[PDB]
């Protein structure tokens, strides 16, 4: 296993062997707990994965094919493995590796190859915020992942919206993230406005999981006194009426969050 992994790492250096090596290493993230430090400390390996990513920046008119996207998605999954490991995550952030993903979170291209990239890139960020570590939250606050998530939340696929909402939610759930978002009215109202637009869209194309994450964001915003006061005036009607009765029929948790939200607002 370790033997194969070191071979595949070497085989990233030859174009003829590179793709197979990427795919095989990616397959080992399920079963090799020490894969991330092996990747991180093997000379050139992180750079090879970043080169995979950088190599398709010129593909963003959008010319990315599904073959190119699947290759890079495997590199990203390897980076996610590094992001998720406690021995490599801090160094991962210190090297600013998430920034290499932001072009894939930024592009508005609707092609399926960019959707695979977008989802996998969101997966890396989501793996970071899943830790709820202050270091992660604060890193993301200074690198402006928030407007990237907001743009996806408004216009992405239902699944991209869900992951991007999950990322913003984890930031809101942190006290520093909530205080940062509520520090200026413009930050808060950008978040509130985008959430309001998703609520309207959800009334037309319902998704129980996306609604759940949107509601959680609202509920957390209502912990902040200034956000509470704005939501007292601007909370979307759809969160208090029968709009989502059918979607909520079995979601005891969201209904309970919605009731808690309204109560907070008095």
């Amino acid at each position: 296993d370790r033997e194969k992994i070191y071979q595949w790492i070497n085989e990233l250096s030859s174009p003829e062997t590179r793709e197979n090596a990427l795919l095989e290493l990616s397959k080992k993230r399920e079963s090799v707990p020490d894969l991330a430090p092996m990747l991180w400390h093997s000379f050139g390996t992180i750079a090879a994965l970043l080169q995979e990513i950088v190599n398709i920046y010129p593909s963003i008119p959008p010319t990315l094919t599904a073959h190119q996207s699947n290759r890079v998605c495997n590199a990203l999954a390897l980076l996610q493995c590094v992001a998720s490991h406690p021995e490599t995550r801090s160094a991962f952030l210190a090297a600013h590796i998430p920034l290499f993903l932001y072009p894939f979170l930024h592009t508005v291209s609707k092609t399926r190859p960019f959707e695979y990239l977008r989802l996998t890139s969101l997966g890396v960020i989501g793996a970071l915020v899943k830790t709820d570590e202050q270091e992660v939250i604060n890193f993301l606050l200074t690198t402006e992942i928030i407007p990237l998530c907001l743009r996806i939340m408004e216009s992405g696929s239902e699944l991209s919206k869900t992951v991007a909402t999950f990322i913003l939610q984890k930031i809101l759930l942190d006290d520093t993230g909530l205080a940062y978002i509520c520090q200026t009215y413009e930050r808060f109202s950008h978040v509130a406005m985008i959430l309001g637009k998703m609520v309207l869209q959800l009334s037309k194309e319902p998704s129980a999981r996306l609604l759940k994450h949107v509601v959680r964001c609202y509920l957390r915003l209502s912990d902040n006194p200034r956000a509470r006061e704005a939501l007292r005036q601007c909370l979307p009607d759809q969160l208090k009426d029968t709009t989502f009765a059918q979607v909520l029929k079995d979601d005891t948790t969201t209904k309970r969050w919605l009731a808690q939200l309204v109560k907070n607002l008095q």
Binding site: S69, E115, Y116, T120, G123
Partner: peptide
């Protein structure tokens, strides 16, 4: 555009597998 070849199926499966790690 609804065409999918193997790389589409592989990349989408990979993406979903990555996201299933987040318990969404």
């Amino acid at each position: 555009h609804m065409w999918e070849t193997l790389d589409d199926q592989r990349a989408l499966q990979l993406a979903l597998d990555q996201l299933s790690l987040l318990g969404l």
